[PDB]
């Protein structure tokens, strides 16, 4: 029996074009360039899901350093102080304190400072 | 195994012993599967063909010179990448039939008959004699025997009166003892065999 091309080809390509909504010009309209961009977007999305975890850690460290230097400590020494005091609060939470509850952050910073002066 | 021996009316006239060598064996499912595929393949007509690039009309000359035109090089307007061109491969007339070993054939039919007995779908009649060809008569007989879905009727010899009475009823097939076969028996839910026909079938298989 003969198998006509049928509707399978159009269905598959439409799915890709729907994933390409919002792409510029032909990249949301033409299957080949759309297909390339959707494939390329896949590699980028994977890469960036791993880069996300570095960018936010980078952001937290920057914020902690600013708040630390408001207590007369560099980030290096603050983190060393916390480790000596056994504090396991991570940089996401330290950054949160620095921004949302600065008094709490200073308490942790003072704890670190005690250990450093020991 | 023992089964009830009926008459056309539908009353039980006691029982009858079927030969265990034919109706009592453990159905070999694997050989039944093969028997069914083999038979259905043997029914295939296999009359299908396409035209390859040699058979398609025209296409002799080279569409254009090999070099210089800037077109892809082509050899014939009936190449398989051309619209209208020859098909690459595709259906060609062939037969699908093949043969199983005789013993596998016998094992298949024995398995299928013994399976009928396991499901209580084997109706044995003292005899089946119709006075005249009359579909009404046959339909009444089948209702008497509580035959609802398809049924295969197996007579010992050519029974013209029965064949004509049952010909027109959907899903009711009439067969001589010689003509019984795996696909027919498996297809039809009930097996109405006559006592005379049972011995003829046993004679061959046993």
């Amino acid at each position: 029996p003969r198998v006509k091309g049928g509707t399978v080809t159009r269905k598959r390509r439409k799915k890709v074009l729907k994933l390409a909504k919002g792409y510029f010009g032909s990249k949301h309209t033409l299957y080949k360039v759309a297909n390339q961009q959707v494939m390329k977007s896949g590699n980028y999305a994977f890469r960036d899901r791993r880069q996300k975890k570095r960018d936010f850690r980078k952001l937290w460290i920057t914020r902690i350093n600013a708040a630390a230097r408001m207590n007369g400590l560099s980030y290096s020494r603050l983190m060393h102080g916390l480790k000596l005091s056994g504090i396991e609060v991570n940089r996401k939470m330290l950054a949160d304190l620095a921004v949302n509850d600065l008094t709490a952050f200073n308490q942790l910073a003072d704890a670190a400072k005690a250990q450093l002066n020991k | 195994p023992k089964v009830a021996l009926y008459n056309q009316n539908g009353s039980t006239a006691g029982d009858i012993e079927l030969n265990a060598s034919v109706f009592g064996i453990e159905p070999n499912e694997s050989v039944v599967f093969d028997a069914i595929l083999m038979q259905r393949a043997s029914l295939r007509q296999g009359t299908h063909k396409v035209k390859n690039r040699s058979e398609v009309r025209g296409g002799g000359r080279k569409p254009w010179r090999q070099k210089g035109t800037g077109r892809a090089r082509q050899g014939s307007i009936r190449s398989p990448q051309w619209r209208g061109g020859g098909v690459v491969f595709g259906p060609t007339p062939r037969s699908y039939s093949y043969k199983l070993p005789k013993k596998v054939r016998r094992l298949a039919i024995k398995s299928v008959l013994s399976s009928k007995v396991i499901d209580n779908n084997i109706i044995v009649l003292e005899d089946l004699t119709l006075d005249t060809a009359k579909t009404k008569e046959m339909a009444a007989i089948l209702k008497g025997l509580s035959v609802e879905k398809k049924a295969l009727i197996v007579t010992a010899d050519a029974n013209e009166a029965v064949a004509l009475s049952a010909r027109n009823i959907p899903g009711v097939t009439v067969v001589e003892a010689n003509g019984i076969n795996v696909l027919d028996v498996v297809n039809h839910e009930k097996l109405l065999i006559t006592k005379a026909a049972v011995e003829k079938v046993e004679e061959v298989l046993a």
Partner: protein, 146 residues
């Protein structure tokens, strides 16, 4: 079995491999033939036993022997086969052929002396091995050549 509940015996059937149907199949693109060269071409490859121009093995070696027109082949029967028969039977080639002990007569039946025979038989055959003749006679039988 039901026509709507058919199952093949496990491992009796496999699905054919279809090459050149995309990357994910693993036989996409080059369809298992690697890259270029004679072996990858359609109807490619050299003839059986060709060695690239190195002299083929068969041509390096010398022909041997001849075929005898009058070559006789005997349907051989060992003593263990005769043991299947009953005592007092005269085992002729006609009896052997009918009972299916031998499939084909060829130039005749030859009895050979492999195995044991514990039955008195009147073996009639075209040829006997020295061992077979002794063994048939040793068990009280007769080994008549015919």
């Amino acid at each position: 079995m039901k026509l709507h509940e058919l199952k093949p015996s496990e491992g009796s059937r496999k699905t054919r491999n279809r090459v050149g149907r995309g990357i994910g199949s693993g036989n996409g693109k080059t369809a298992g033939k690697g890259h270029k060269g004679q072996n990858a071409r359609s109807g490619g490859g050299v003839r059986p036993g060709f060695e690239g121009g190195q002299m083929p093995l068969f041509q390096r070696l010398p022909k041997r022997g001849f075929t005898n027109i009058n070559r006789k082949e005997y349907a051989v029967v060992n003593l263990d086969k005769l043991n299947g028969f009953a005592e007092g039977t005269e085992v002729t080639p006609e009896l052997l052929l009918e009972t299916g002990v031998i499939s084909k007569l060829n130039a005749g039946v030859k009895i050979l002396g492999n195995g044991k025979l514990e039955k008195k038989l009147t073996v009639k055959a075209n040829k006997f091995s020295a061992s077979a003749k002794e063994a048939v006679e040793a068990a009280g039988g007769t080994a008549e050549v015919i």
